[PDB]
Amino acid sequence: TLIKDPMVLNIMLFGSDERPGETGYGRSDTMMLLSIDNRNKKLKLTSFMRDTYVNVPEWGDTKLTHAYSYGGPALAIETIERNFGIDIDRYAVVYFDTFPGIVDTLGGIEVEMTQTEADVMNESVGPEFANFTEGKNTLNGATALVYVRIRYGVGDDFGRTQRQRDFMLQVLNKVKGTRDVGTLLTLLTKILPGVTTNISVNEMAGLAGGAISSYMDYPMYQFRLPEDGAFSAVDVDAGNVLAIDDWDAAREHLQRFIYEDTVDPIYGPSTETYGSEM
Template sequence: MSRPPEGRLPGKKLPDSSLSERSEAGRRQARWIRPLQLAALTLAGLCGGGYYALSASGQGSGAVVLSGSLPNFTLLLAGRDVIYCYYHQPCKDQNQRKGVIQTSNTDTLMLVKVRGRRVSVLSIPRDTNVGEFDPRKSAADQKVNAKYWDGGPQALVSAVETITGERVDNYLIVRTEEAARVIEALGGLDVNVPKGGIEWIDKAADVNLKLSAGPHHLDGQEGVWYLRVRKGFGDDYGRIDHQKQALSQLASKLTTARGLSALPTILSVMGGVETNLDPGLLQSVQPVLSQFKLSFATLPTNTIPHSFNLAVDRQKLAQVWGDALSSAPSGGGPTSQDKANLNKAGQVTVLLEDASGAQLGPAMVRALNESGYPKVQLSTLPRSNEQSQVFTQTDVEVAQQLADQLNLPRLQGERFAVQPGQIGVLLGSDARQLFAALNRFAPHPPVTQPPVN
């Protein structure tokens, strides 16, 4: 991919005198037009077609081919704990409500919003208060994770609607053994354990998870333990962040041959969970999964004084999970928001982590520079099978723009290793295929000439 001569726009021929005759207004316009056009040529091209995907039949037509209209709905995904009747002994009937010593909470809560090609996932911290905090009532009873036990799925749905202000159309309540079957059917989970490793041993829950720092491939049961553990990730927010990464990876596997073969298992699991979701929806959506653009965010909260409960911050919620972020790109010309984000792109620092194992980092730095991101810091990591992704804390709009250009999922979190003014990009081993056009710029080992006799 050759860079156009300085002062020229791709595909445009300018007379030799054009630069000297161009007005100041024209120069100002070129400063944002040129990177925007380069973004389309470089980043979208590197993704093997950018925003557009192949049709369900696998024939490359250059445009999205859909059978019918894409769905628009919301889905509440909840993971429920095990119910214990005696010490170290789970109840044989996991649906009983009497004679238990430990009830079933829903510490994992995600609200999925599907709007056209956008799939936005909002993680809700387990300690989030439902409505206004009442100091006269039990703090634990006011937390969202207790509502399922109090009144079943409908009570949980109502609580999430109160917290987010969103209508919840469907719910899916999953137990640990069901989640393990899905992870196993999709081929397991690839993770990168942080420094210090993870050790979680809980005889009561029959958990025995010991992972050293570095990359690991987990089976279904280990994957569920990893998603539930907080130790090694700091707190519930850290756990939520690595849950986002895992869910993004599993969702991407649904579009592979392994995902297709796993569909019967996933459908059989859905037959045993608590849900009001039509099982046929997954089958109808599966052919167009590769066209969905994923983004993940964490519900912003503030600590309620004299309590461990959390109050939702609605102003920040609109910034990280608003309708503007949930709408798909129009495909038309640049909007005023596009221009504003492009100006911000020149100010943020992109922390590029190359774990592709193919030395794609230097070539990606060049592509990012040409696309309006002049501040790029490259670090090379050991090869990782984690999914390539864009991640951020506060600079969500710019991160979304970059994720769209790279055709990668965008993750917003509270504990990602980025600061305000920084956006992270992780290149996993899948980057070799996603950005195959970069291979020509990647360094190659020197060719050793045979000795001359």
Template sequence: MRQDRHEKRKKRRKVRWSAVFFILLLLIGGVGIYSYLQFNEGLADSQKQTGEVQEEYTFNGSKDENGSINILLLGSDSREGETSRADTIMIASYNPDRGTYKLASIMRDTYIGIPGHGSNKINTAFALGGPELLRQTIKENFDVDLEHYAIVDFQGFVQLIDTAFPNGVEVDVEKRMSTNIDVTIEPGLQRLDGEHLLGYVRFRHDAVGDFGRVERQQKVIKEVGSQLASIQTVPKLPKLIGVVAPYINTNMGAGDMVYIGRGFISRESRNIDSLRIPVDQSYENQRISGAGAVLAIDLEKNKQALKDFLAQ
């Protein structure tokens, strides 16, 4: 009799845990289906606006030995036909074990050696050999290898902002901006839509030039990241990835992008540490025949600064 009762309890436990397991499977499956449908919805919306076929690139980067996911992040503007050169060069690094996000901007006029092509501005490496040659250039000069690349068309940035922030992104604009950015932005606290925010990060026609532009780019990425990391954004994430997918040429899968995005959103602290190369007091402005105005850098000082920054 006692054995029968014991057997019945075991059966009830089996039934109960089977039911729990089944419910979990339904939840996981439902989330997966929802994410898939949301991604495809965003993808379909964007594909209506762009019919361009993306160029396929070879990229032979390797995984980071410390477990970080290192991405060569490049910005280009197809509207101006300037896709042959990288307008923006960044290294984005995410370490899931430490929960750290880092962003290092490399000034496009940085004058360094390009494997097989002598010395020139670093963005020339992309024009000569795409993201792979730029990866080799960064590895040879700074001893940092990159596993992934992502070339982001600026129009994709506009789509992301307008989809994620229908009311715009709040930015404290430091001065009036209009030269060569196709919009006019007034100083003060403003809510900027995608086009105006793009103009803000592209503006460089003032006394500080590209240095001010890089500073604004990092400022906006931090602000957008902070505002994206809200409970309202979590369900939107797959759709947002779908929206920008047609404007991103990358060797990363959509699942990888969602993984990194969700990792950021789920953190208690959502700080993004930033660095600019060249660092202060490590460069001088020069004009070199065949390259024009360049930043001649102290390579060893900047190499160590970048390696230390990514290792922290």
């Protein structure tokens, strides 16, 4: 029933600034499918919004993020599969406290934002670390962590959701270009302390092999559900959610973006392309 290509490897990535509280699973606002598309030699990063109104197994209709709260990675995965119809292979949770290590090892990450970034940013760090402008500011590990947590009131909530999403795409893109072995090794070193994953050590080796020999040469595309036209922000019992008016289309678009021509038998050939090359 689920769309599954041997040549396309789906590893879900969770960005979490809340490790398991030791009853429970903590929390993850960010969800990002990595699709290693060996068929079309491409890397694809599909984001799913925190507040997407979805059907969680045994919990009915609710915010997508609640799946993780209630059941951790495993339930969130199952919710994605049931609502979107694709088969997730593996998953990895990466904690925000792992980030400083990552950034420094990469030698900075470049982001951008209005003169409001610089304010909240420059008046957050030391007056002598305050070095933020309007265009391209480079963050170090230290500032990165500040960057992804900063919230300018409750209206800037989505702005944080998106600062965190863009930050993550950056890191991934920058890791993607990175060719130096020592850097890569060290990057792994920065990650292990803050990673939970069902990927076996052996599978991790194969993937590091794949990445060096092939994967990092693939061009990389990103895509997001729900799409920009395709939802409303309705207030329900579960709170303020993002209702997708056309689920059949959400699925068609996602499954096309990842599997492309392989789903021609389900939806017929299309001339549409989804996502954007990074």
